[PDB]
Amino acid sequence: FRVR
Amino acid sequence: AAAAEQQQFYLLLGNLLSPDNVVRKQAEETYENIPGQSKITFLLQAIRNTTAAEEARQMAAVLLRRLLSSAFDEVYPALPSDVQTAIKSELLMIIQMETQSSMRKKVCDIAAELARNLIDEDGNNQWPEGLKFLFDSVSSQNVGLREAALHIFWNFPGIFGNQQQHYLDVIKRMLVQCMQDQEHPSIRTLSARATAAFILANEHNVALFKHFADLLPGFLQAVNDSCYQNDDSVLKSLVEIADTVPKYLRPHLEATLQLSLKLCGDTSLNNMQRQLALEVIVTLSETAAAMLRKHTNIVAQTIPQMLAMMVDLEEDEDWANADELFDSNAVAGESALDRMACGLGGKLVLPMIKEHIMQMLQNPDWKYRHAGLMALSAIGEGCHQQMEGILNEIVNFVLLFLQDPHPRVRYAACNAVGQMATDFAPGFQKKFHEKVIAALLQTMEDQGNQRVQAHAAAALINFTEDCPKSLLIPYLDNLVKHLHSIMVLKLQELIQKGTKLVLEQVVTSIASVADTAEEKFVPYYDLFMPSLKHIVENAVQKELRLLRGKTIECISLIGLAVGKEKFMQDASDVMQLLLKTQTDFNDMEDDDPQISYMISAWARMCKILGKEFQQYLPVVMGPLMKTASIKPEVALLDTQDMENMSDDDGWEFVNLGDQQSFGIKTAGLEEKSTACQMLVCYAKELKEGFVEYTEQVVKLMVPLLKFYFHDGVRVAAAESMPLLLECARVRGPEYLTQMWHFMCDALIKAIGTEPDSDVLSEIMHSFAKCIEVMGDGCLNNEHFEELGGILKAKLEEHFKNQELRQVKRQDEDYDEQVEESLQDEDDNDVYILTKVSDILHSIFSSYKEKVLPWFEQLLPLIVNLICPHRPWPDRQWGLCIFDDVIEHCSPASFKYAEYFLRPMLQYVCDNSPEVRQAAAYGLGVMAQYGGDNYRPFCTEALPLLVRVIQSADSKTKENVNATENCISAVGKIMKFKPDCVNVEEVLPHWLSWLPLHEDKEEAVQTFNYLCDLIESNHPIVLGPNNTNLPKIFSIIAEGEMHEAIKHEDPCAKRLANVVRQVQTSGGLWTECIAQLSPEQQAAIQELLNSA
Ligand code: NI
């Protein structure tokens, strides 16, 4: 968005 | 009385046919109130009476079909089966006694519909007499009876529930023999329309297309015959076939493609017929392009077909004055070319059109040069990747056509330039700013030809719109001075006669330059502001309605670019302009022009003014709500009722099956969407300031989650849900629950039914954000049960679609471009999995351990993502879902460790950095929130994490976030479980991995731990005699990489207190600073001044  | 109500019926029927509205709006009302149970033997007798007027029988038969298509459950049930089976057999007689083929078609439309409602009861049709009628009529040597049978089978294809088992092979016999009926051409044409309607009805049935493949050669022959007799009835059938079920055409596709090319190429046929023939090919390039890509021989021949239609221009005497608003061959071919370049792709299409465009541009015909520039404009979108390389040659050549001896060619050149500025952005702007701006300004000035001067201004708007601010700023003084000059001269001309076409575009062009220039436009504000303000007070006439709206847009975009400070100088005199023009626009109540201009201009004032906009809220909210609530006019007409409403153009109709149709007034659909997007803006900008409107906006928006007519509205409705809860928050949780109550059920239904994937992802993200707004206790047990089923279905579909896409590969027509589409489909399915993880994250974060039993229903599906052979995004997101279970649902999380723990331990070493990051994260939250049950696994995890951190390339742009997360996971192991590690020994290595600066969350966590270590009673981390304290100065110097948020975070103050305490130790301070680069030295100063 980016994340994990 | 029986004979008394029959004689008075003929005059009442003719009364609703008189040309004047006096008796017309008095005889229709008397008819409707009549009992529907008696309207059967009364209206069918007016068609049977062949001695009565032929136009009254046309109306009686059209009125009899409508009473059966619209009303049925009140008229046919509870009526005696003596008159039930009498209207069945009398209707069958009318068709046998009919001499006129016009009436035979009207009464066959009543034979069907009656056949349709009887059959559509359970499945098996209650009218086997209607079935026997077709087999005996198609078999009877009478052309009229044969034609009547084909009309009933075209209107209602499949009047059977048990067709397959036996009546299916007899349908093939019937149509095959009818297409062989040479003695009559209308019987052959009727069976082609029937074959198509039947194949369309039997959609998805791939076994039936394979069996009926033998009918396609005769069907194609029937379009080839009907077309040369002025009949585009069978040609429409083929276009419908190519659109809905193109794979049916696969066996004889070359014959289909060759015929469609022949009809289109044949000059003799009318425009409507040739365009429809092109449409067969154009549709196949969208619906089945993979199949069409194999017949290159035919697509090559279609290119000059479209080009020859594009050069079918009329020499409009007085074109330069009037406004051109589109059915012509020149528009049909051009659009078809764009659509086919997009459909098949620039790899195949550009080579086929390249030399043809050069032969038309380099020709003395004008119509050829115009067609060449419009073909260049059309192919741009679909072939732009292939057109780069020749781009500098194309642009330099097209720029010469602006000085062409024909004004219409100078206009198509404007179009070519403006469209390339959009199709090739921002490469076009970076490569040709000097040449294109200079050439367009010259066309906008030295023309003295309104239309060309206006189009050059329009091309300039396209150019500046996609121009990077970076390279527009040097051209500001030049472009601005030139635009001002043209604005002031075209404003005098508005006063002399009333010419404004160019001035409208100059204003919008200025707005575009201002908007892109942002803060750099303020030195040029005084040069335009009083000129534009003067325009909105001048332009009050209905002719200048667009010129006034465009000036308001320009005005509001100029103040928005310069910012609230610079705008405050002329803000009062300009806010009153809007206030006065709102009552001027509202006192002449309408829809479509100034509406969207005004809405957006007020919203721009709210972004500029912020908290000072509040006073204008009742003046802007009222009108905004009215256009945001427009219920569009929907009609459910039947048959060819898209000819009388074709003149509207905006009234679009979607032809549903079984003769019924659906129509929708597209007027204001974009205005509604604009207003809904504006309500989302007010909610976001104002927050707390919008509470008075939150309830009525919530009441408006909830139903728009189910507004399938316009996606932009649904997205706005979805987006507004958490924003409205965010506004309402200021009134407390009791009002918050009152708002959430309207939303909750509707938001959940939307997730389970939403058709579009991108609109679904906004609804799913929105629902998750509302759960965060006031979680725990925010969900019914019915809602939890519903949501469980919906998420489980969405997970089941994720894997089902994985198998389906695999089966789409391993198909005769599989190519790299179909793989590109399958990868797009996959990307969407993954984004839905991220939103499943999102809805899940907020439920876990808010409900915590409590919700693990509910989650057990999704457990086999979540485990199914973390399987070893699944694609990496599945393993990444399944790990993410388990990370939220560890973080928000521990220590109970451990009961379920048999589902995640061992794969998560193993995955820390995965080839995918996205998988590695999700695994490393889970182990860090395992130490922090997990509890004592994870203790042995924290001792085990450590060397796995250190192996990733310590490997080479661990800090590549590809693997930084995964390595940082591993560093932070090692850190959390140290801080939260120090009995599972010899922290005193790993700390030196840990310190060397610092600082973090890509994962901002983990940069905060690592720095907060580093501060605990430095602040500790016996630091260890400082080194004996502060030897590695100067190294901590280098870690804290980043800093440079915005890791520690200067003010926001508590560690920012903590790190600057640890650093400034050193200042009191002269030698130690200077040692630590003397070994920092001057960029790093400034970063320590920057932190110390702000924390
Ligand atoms: Ni509720």
Helix-strand layout with pairing:
The complex is a heterodimer of chains A (4) and B (1091).
Chain A: no helix or strand
Chain B: H1 4-15, H2 21-32, H3 39-43, H4 45-48, H5 54-69, H6 81-97, H7 101-119, H8 128-139, H9 143-155, H10 163-179, H11 185-201, H12 206-211, H13 216-226, H14 234-244, H15 253-265, H16 271-287, H17 289-292, H18 296-310, H19 329-344, H20 346-361, H21 367-387, H22 391-398, H23 407-423, H24 427-445, H25 450-465, H26 469-472, H27 476-496, H28 501-517, H29 525-538, H30 545-567, H31 571-586, H32 594-609, H33 617-628, E1 634-635, E2 651-654, E3 662-665, H34 669-686, H35 691-704, H36 711-728, H37 733-753, H38 757-773, H39 781-808, H40 816-847, H41 852-855, H42 859-865, H43 872-888, H44 897-907, H45 913-928, H46 935-950, H47 960-976, H48 983-993, H49 1000-1015, H50 1029-1036, H51 1050-1060, H52 1066-1074, H53 1078-1090
Antiparallel strand pairs in B: 1-3, 2-3
Helix pairs in contact in B: 5-7, 6-7, 7-9, 8-9, 9-11, 10-11, 11-13, 11-14, 14-16, 15-16, 15-18, 16-19, 18-19, 18-20, 19-20, 19-21, 20-21, 21-23, 22-24, 23-24, 23-25, 24-25, 24-27, 25-28, 27-28, 27-29, 28-30, 29-30, 30-32, 31-32, 32-34, 33-34, 34-36, 35-36, 35-37, 36-37, 36-38, 37-38, 37-39, 38-40, ...
Nickel (II) ion binds at residues 741, 744, 780 of chain B.
